[PDB]
Amino acid sequence: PMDDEQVLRHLDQLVNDALDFNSSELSKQRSEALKYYFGEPFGNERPGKSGIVSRDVQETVDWIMPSLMKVFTSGGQVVKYEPDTAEDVEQAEQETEYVNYLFMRKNEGFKVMFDWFQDTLMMKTGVVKVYVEEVLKPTFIRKDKKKREIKVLCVKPENFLVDRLATCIDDARFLCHREKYTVSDLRLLGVPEDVIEEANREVWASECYTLLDVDGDGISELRRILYVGDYIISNEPWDCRPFADLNAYRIAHKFHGMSVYDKIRDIQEIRSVLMRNIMDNIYRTNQGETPQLSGEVYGMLDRLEADRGKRTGITDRTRGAAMSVNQLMTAAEQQIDLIARMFAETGVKRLFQLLHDHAIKYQNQEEVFQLRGKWVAVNPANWRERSDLTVTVGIGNMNKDQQMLHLMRIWEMAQAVVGGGGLGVLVSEQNLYNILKEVTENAGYKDPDRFWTNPNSPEALQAKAIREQKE
Amino acid sequence: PMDDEQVLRHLDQLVNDALDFNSSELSKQRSEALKYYFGEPFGNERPGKSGIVSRDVQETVDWIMPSLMKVFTSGGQVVKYEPDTAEDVEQAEQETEYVNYLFMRKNEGFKVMFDWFQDTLMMKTGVVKVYVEEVLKPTFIRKDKKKREIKVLCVKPENFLVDRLATCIDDARFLCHREKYTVSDLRLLGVPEDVIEEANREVWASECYTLLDVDGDGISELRRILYVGDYIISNEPWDCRPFADLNAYRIAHKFHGMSVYDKIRDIQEIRSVLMRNIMDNIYRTNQGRSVVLDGQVNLEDLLTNEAAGIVRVKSMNSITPLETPQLSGEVYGMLDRLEADRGKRTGITDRTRGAAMSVNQLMTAAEQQIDLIARMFAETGVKRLFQLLHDHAIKYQNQEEVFQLRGKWVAVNPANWRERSDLTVTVGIGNMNKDQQMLHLMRIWEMAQAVVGGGGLGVLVSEQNLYNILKEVTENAGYKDPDRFWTNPNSPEALQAKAIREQKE
């Protein structure tokens, strides 16, 4: 109640505690993870002898990143709505195309989400921050004034202090984001003085999102504070935290989740020590009477790949009737599927966040989605729903399998029925439109290459209803 | 405020610090990378025995390079704009053709970008610089005066000092580029004196791009400084940095990225040491370890294998040739998986290539990772394209294009369009040619003939879009307009052929 300065010291104490805990624990964990990733010596490499370290997490990343790239960065069909059936063609595909054509294709493409996966994998936490800027440079036709725009960036998760008792995104009572915000940004803000920290004095700044109440009442909503150096700040009530804090494994109820290093450290250790023992054996055999050993050790070497086989990389070969249907049961129940699954729903929250961040006010922009025309999306409905089913453990039928199955089955059916029964009884051109259309989006040429629409058109009456009837 | 000389010493100190850090770390890393690449001995090779080194990164590079050549050095369809639907044919494909037909096909071809790729796979960073020069040699018809053109080149990446706290292109507060700029260039500029450094005196020069404020106010935009030797310089308010700092991997939050050497050094080391092991095993199996005493055979058995056959000692009859126990060929098995190691890292196409006869080239040879690799180059090259577009959006020339036809307006006053696209060559739709070839052709043609027999040409696609039907085939064959115009949308020949004789047949 009526707090103006005690909030500053309370936030400073929270920042210090988060610094201590997060820095010590998570920083040491990620340093160990990086040393394992980079093949750095584990410290047990005694001097005077080779301490070669074999990297194992790196190739695991090498297999699993491209799978994510296909399952996410492939078209705008990844995530949908399925809203009320009547009110879908008005906005559903329109809003979905807007949000994905913004995020991809307008917000540094895959780079932000690529680094998001990188952070959630190597360094145990993948989180990004959504923010706004102003568009400038009009003609003073092309008057680009008063336009404001929304970006998202990696938060540099090394600078993402947060209370450890959250275990979820919408549970943290104190969110800290550390940045530089150099003296140019300070003069843009208008502060005349400086802090402990040549014009550019490498100053450091921070931003805090936390629930508080300085109005002499009950606990109010989120508050955004531009706590830089205990100086002029930008205090403002907030509505939604734009963070996603991926854990990459959905660990038990804690804010951050364990990484690939936390599970393959033992495998890397055993591989490195056994190969070092192999080279030491080769040495002692070269100098030499010490009895020799057997190659069966190398045989166990093999199952270490099966170890990466048993953890994540079940596809030891290139890929793990009708020639191995469903791509051989998704390469014998590939786990990356479920991985993509939770990653998808994480993006779901982000897909909500930006939507609200866009549902307030952006601009009068239109879409080039297969056609000209899109209403002003500054006042849409949120629809309070989001769907990521068709790319994962749900329907999730990847391109080629459903492609070949549907095409050959419906084509043999169509020819058989046309010969025997006819087009009238079963599917007709009204739905042969969709028959062509699934192929169109299978090869990615939906509207422009092939229209093939003919539902009820001026060409329909003259072709389907005049000459096809009087022929 | 009002700095004119302290800026010189400040930039000098920044240059020295960048020299120290970049030289030491990155230069030692790339020296090790080059020694690995060239098969140089690693330094562990004891004297008196072979130092054979097996090169492994070389074939990896020689396999990944051609794929990049196909996915980039093939047509100008790599990048599109897709602006507002109606206002695309005006500039979108027009500006796309301008930028591609200039960059490729007018700037020394693919060479530099090839090396650019080479850089990002060997130098650990692929970065190029974009500049301008003036056109000359008029007739005094062909009066070519004061024309200028925009070029791009390798920055000699050993001469690309930059602060280590950027982690991105548009984050560096100090960009340094070192060059020679010999005395001919100096006399062109007009400096009368020289520096510490025959007419050509191997002088060295540098250029700095850095944001500062010498006007007594807040930090201004970038500044371009021709800091050569603390002498006459060319300072200028600069806005755009023409660099791309590839890393070929999109590594974590740092400016320069690790390369193929930094991940395959262990593989090369183990391969070389094991093949040297194999040949040393061959040796010791050839000789056999014969041990003699002192006082007999003073000449060390002649290493037990010469043109003697009989050792001969003096009078003792024990003789101690011990046969070193043989090994098994199962060691060779690891040999195989080492290629699979190159398979597991980047080269999954161990064979020539990694229903409907392996659809989409068998899922791009079983999820070929280079796609995502190629992907990053896209989102890098886009920026460069945008950059060069600006270099042509300010002022380039009034010349036209030969894109399938004569006619192109002046390219000095387009909009920037503030966006590009890279979905047609990579992890996006972006599948290589023959997949679309086979799929589109047989599929849509068999639907078309079935409907023409059943429904007809009018109900589905007509010649207005049979135009495009032929067009995907033409672009797959590379002869789009001139060989096969096939246009007939609504034309004077259309009315006499499609609307007169075809209707009154």
UniProtKB/TrEMBL annotation, chain A:
Keyword annotations: Coiled coil
Domain of life: Viruses
Cystine pairings recorded for this chain: 176-208
Name this protein carries in UniProt: ORF.04
Organism classification: Viruses, Duplodnaviria, Heunggongvirae, Uroviricota, Caudoviricetes
